Amino acid sequence: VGTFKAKDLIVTPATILKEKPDPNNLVFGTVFTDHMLTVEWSSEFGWEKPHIKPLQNLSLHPGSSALHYAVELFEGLKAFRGVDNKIRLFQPNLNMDRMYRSAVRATLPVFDKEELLECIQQLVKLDQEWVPYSTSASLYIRPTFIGTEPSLGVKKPTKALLFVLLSPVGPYFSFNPVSLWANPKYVRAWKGGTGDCKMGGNYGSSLFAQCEAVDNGCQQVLWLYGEDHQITEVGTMNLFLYWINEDGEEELATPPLDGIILPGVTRRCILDLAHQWGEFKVSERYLTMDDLTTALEGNRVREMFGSGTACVVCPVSDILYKGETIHIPTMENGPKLASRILSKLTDIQYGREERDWTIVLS
Amino acid sequence: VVGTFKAKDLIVTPATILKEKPDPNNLVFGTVFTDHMLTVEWSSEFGWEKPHIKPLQNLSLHPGSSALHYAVELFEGLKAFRGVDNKIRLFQPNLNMDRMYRSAVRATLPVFDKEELLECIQQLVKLDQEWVPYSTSASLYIRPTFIGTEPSLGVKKPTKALLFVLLSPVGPYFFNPVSLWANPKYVRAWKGGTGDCKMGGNYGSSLFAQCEAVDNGCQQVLWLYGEDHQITEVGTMNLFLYWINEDGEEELATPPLDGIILPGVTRRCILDLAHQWGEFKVSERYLTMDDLTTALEGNRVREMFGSGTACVVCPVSDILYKGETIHIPTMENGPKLASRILSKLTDIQYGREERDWTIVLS
Ligand SMILES: Cc1ccccc1Oc1cc(-n2c(=O)cc(C(F)(F)c3ccccc3)[nH]c2=O)c(F)cc1C#N
Numbered sequence: 001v002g003t004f005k006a007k008d009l010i011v012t013p014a015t016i017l018k019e020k021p022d023p024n025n026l027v028f029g030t031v032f033t034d035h036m037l038t039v040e041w042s043s044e045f046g047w048e049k050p051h052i053k054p055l056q057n058l059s060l061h062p063g064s065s066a067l068h069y070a071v072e073l074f075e076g077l078k079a080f081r082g083v084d085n086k087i088r089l090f091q092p093n094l095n096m097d098r099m100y101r102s103a104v105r106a107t108l109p110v111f112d113k114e115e116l117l118e119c120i121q122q123l124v125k126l127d128q129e130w131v132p133y134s135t136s137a138s139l140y141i142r143p144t145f146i147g148t149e150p151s152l153g154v155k156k157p158t159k160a161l162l163f164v165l166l167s168p169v170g171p172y173f174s175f176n177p178v179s180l181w182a183n184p185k186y187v188r189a190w191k192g193g194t195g196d197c198k199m200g201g202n203y204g205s206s207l208f209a210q211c212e213a214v215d216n217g218c219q220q221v222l223w224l225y226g227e228d229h230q231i232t233e234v235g236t237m238n239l240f241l242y243w244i245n246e247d248g249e250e251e252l253a254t255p256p257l258d259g260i261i262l263p264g265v266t267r268r269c270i271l272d273l274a275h276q277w278g279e280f281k282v283s284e285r286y287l288t289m290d291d292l293t294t295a296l297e298g299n300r301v302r303e304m305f306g307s308g309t310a311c312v313v314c315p316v317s318d319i320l321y322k323g324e325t326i327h328i329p330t331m332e333n334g335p336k337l338a339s340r341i342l343s344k345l346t347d348i349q350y351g352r353e354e355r356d357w358t359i360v361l362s
Numbered sequence: 363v364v365g366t367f368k369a370k371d372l373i374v375t376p377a378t379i380l381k382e383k384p385d386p387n388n389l390v391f392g393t394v395f396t397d398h399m400l401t402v403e404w405s406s407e408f409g410w411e412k413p414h415i416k417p418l419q420n421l422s423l424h425p426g427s428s429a430l431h432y433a434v435e436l437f438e439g440l441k442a443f444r445g446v447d448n449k450i451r452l453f454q455p456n457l458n459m460d461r462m463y464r465s466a467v468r469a470t471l472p473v474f475d476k477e478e479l480l481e482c483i484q485q486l487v488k489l490d491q492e493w494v495p496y497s498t499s500a501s502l503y504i505r506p507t508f509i510g511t512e513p514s515l516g517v518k519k520p521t522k523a524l525l526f527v528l529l530s531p532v533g534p535y536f537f538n539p540v541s542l543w544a545n546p547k548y549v550r551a552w553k554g555g556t557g558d559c560k561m562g563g564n565y566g567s568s569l570f571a572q573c574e575a576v577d578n579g580c581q582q583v584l585w586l587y588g589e590d591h592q593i594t595e596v597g598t599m600n601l602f603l604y605w606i607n608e609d610g611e612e613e614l615a616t617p618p619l620d621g622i623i624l625p626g627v628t629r630r631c632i633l634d635l636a637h638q639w640g641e642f643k644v645s646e647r648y649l650t651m652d653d654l655t656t657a658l659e660g661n662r663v664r665e666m667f668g669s670g671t672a673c674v675v676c677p678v679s680d681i682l683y684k685g686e687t688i689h690i691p692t693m694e695n696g697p698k699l700a701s702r703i704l705s706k707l708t709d710i711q712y713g714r715e716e717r718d719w720t721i722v723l724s
């Protein structure tokens with residue numbers, strides 16, 4: 001049990017630098033910056049010194065457990081060029097906490113969260129000109145952690161690689177609301193599974209349903225669970241419902257963290273803002289398709305949206321379920337709460353207001 | 363685009379320095395690799411490249427490869443056997459090709475011609491045929507692997523992939539019976555999931571329980587499902603119970619293929635042999651911990667074993683469950699059925715008798 005240290009960083013600058021992309025013509029996760037972070041681990045010697053070096057292919061033994069048994073996890077967070085031209089991270093300590101927890105569940109080696117964050121800051125700082133000159137674009141940060149043991153054995157890995165990629169990304173909407181594909185045949189996560197960690201294995205099994213969604217003109221899967229068809233996640237995003245509940249109370253509701261919900265940073269921020277405002281009830285509670293269709297019949301639904309680093313908030317206009325299209329009146333209700341949340345989080349991200357939730361770059 | 367690769371297009375780059383073969387008695391499963399590997403590249407733009415047999419080398423993967431982030435990956439496991447007549451045989455290899463194709467469709471990886479892949483695998487084994495051990499208790503493990511290599515972080519069907527095959531000489535095990543760790547907190551697979559496919563994501567999520575098993579002196583996890591604790595899989599192997607059932611009938615029972623069971627080639631072969639012998643009832647049926655503990659109290663259990671390519675038959679002696687050790691009297695009952703199955707399958711594998719289940723190396 002040990003850690004790499006940022007003070008040990010070895011920095012090999014690229015001698016040929018790539019042209020930055022047009023900030024308006026950015027496709028998510030396709031353009032990479034000049035440099036990457038790599039840190040090697042072995043059970044025999046522990047963590048090697050961390051390296052910032054030119055973006056390169058990984059050289060992996062074809063037996064690597066990441067390729068056979070998905071011994072792997074990732075994170076997603078962003079750097080933002082402020083209205084004051086200062087680059088900020090947003091709640092990055094929550095990403096480090098989740099990455100450490102995911103590592104323990106994956107049986108990958110633990111590391112010092114502060115040392116990783118400082119290595120990430122030094123990587124962003126070196127490639128800081130890649131943080132887009134735009135109030136609607138950002139630099140996506142992809143910490144990734146893979147088993148690299150050259151053996152086919154099913155066992156705790158004795159070799160691993162922690163790396164970080166940087167990708168300039170545009171606004172999710174280049175509010176264009178999403179249509180959701182609701183097919184109960186496919187289950188994202190089960191009680192006693194890894195659905196509450198950002199482990200690669202949760203996503204490979206989800207691709208088929210996503211291609212079926214797209215084949216039916218939908219952008220995301222509505223992940224249903226159990227005999228009562230609980231609504232759990234809006235594809236890669238946490239699920240919020242703003243409605244009049246069964247007791248006639250104005251309520252912001254989201255599924256509870258009972259093992260099948262990824263605990264989103266954005267979700268946490270939205271719940272914290274909603275509690276802070278104290279203008280309506282805030283409930284972590286089960287929501288079923290029946291609860292939703294009963295509410296829609298009673299004109300009790302105001303807004304439905306996903307939350308995530310990639311979108312901030314993603315309004316939902318429609319659900320395809322049992323061969324019918326179910327309208328959700330989000331965009332006919334402003335969407336007032338969705339807009340307020342987007343405006344608040346964006347104002348914090350781009351330094352339009354001071355917050356405990358941002359760190360100015362190292 | 364080229365819709366499938368063809369074996370007739372094989373490009374063979376032989377190794378100029380060959381490695382010393384291992385002692386067949388000193389083999390740790392899946393740690394020793396032969397001189398050569400098969401690699402076939404795919405892109406959406408051009409389709410399948412020509413297949414290559416070349417020296418075992420590291421893979422050069424874009425660090426954005428979806429195999430590393432979203433477990434876009436699957437694998438197979440089959441064996442070559444050097445016969446008593448010195449002819450090298452494969453065992454039901456077309457069942458592996460069928461399962462790999464099915465797993466590829468569910469993974470959204472590109473389809474391939476099953477006959478062309480098998481012919482490429484035969485040509486690889488033929489080149490490295492001296493690696494097929496000179497022993498009636500050792501074999502050559504064949505590890506077809508299929509990974510997404512798309513250099514982009516988007517969640518979607520991969521537009522780039524690599525199909526590769528590794529060869530690894532393995533010994534008779536990895537009868538020394540196994541102790542099973544039964545903890546219902548962890549679930550291997552769920553209805554609506556991918557547990558009936560050999561997708562990497564099914565194994566990364568299962569690793570924590572296996573490391574907890576080993577920490578408690580157990581070699582495999584007994585995978586429990588549902589509120590009645592159905593016994594589903596003996597770790598990486600299908601589960602067989604030989605017992606006097608509730609009706610007082612001698613019975614060989616295995617869980618049914620209801621979506622949470624990997625449809626094992628060995629399982630299929632054992633059911634076929636058992637039906638052919640007709641000496642007891644053969645049942646694909648649910649089995650619970652309560653069924654098992656009630657049977658053990660009534661002295662109704664004869665044998666419990668796992669089945670899989672890697673072991674053939676793996677007798678079970680003990681289950682750790684709710685802080686107690688439960689003895690299974692497998693090794694005090696011969697184990698007569700386990701021995702008979704092992705003897706029959708190895709007689710077929712090593713060419714001691716003719717069978718529709720083996721193919722002589724092309
Ligand atoms: C040391 C020892 C003593 C006694 C019994 C077993 C032992 O070793 C183990 C081997 C395995 N083990 C693999 O390492 C790989 C495969 C596979 F590659 F064949 C496969 C992978 C994935 C899916 C199917 C098969 N099978 C499999 O059982 C394991 F999971 C756990 C242990 C333990 N402990």
Ligand SMILES: Cc1ccccc1Oc1cc(-n2c(=O)cc(C(F)(F)c3ccccc3)[nH]c2=O)c(F)cc1C#N
Pocket residue numbers: 028029076172173203214218219220235236237308309310515516517518
């Ligand atoms: C961009 C867009 C805007 C509007 C309409 C469609 C869009 O395209 C999609 C993007 C995504 N998509 C990702 O590709 C990757 C992430 C992630 F990298 F942020 C992540 C990964 C894994 C887990 C969490 C987040 N998020 C995410 O939403 C998707 F899943 C589906 C579609 C569709 N159709």
Ligand SMILES: *Cc1c(COP(=O)(O)O)cnc(C)c1O
Pocket residue numbers: 076198233235236237238262263264265266267307308309310
């Ligand atoms: C990453 C993720 C989220 C959102 O997490 P954020 O930290 O808000 O970006 C939601 N659901 C799933 C399944 C996820 O993987």
Ligand SMILES: *Cc1c(COP(=O)(O)O)cnc(C)c1O
Pocket residue numbers: 439560595597598599600624625626627628629669670671672
């Ligand atoms: C591969 C596998 C089996 C059995 O496979 P065989 O085809 O008999 O080698 C059983 N259970 C699991 C979980 C597996 O991955």
Ligand SMILES: [Mg+2]
Pocket residue numbers: 475477478
């Ligand atoms: Mg053909």
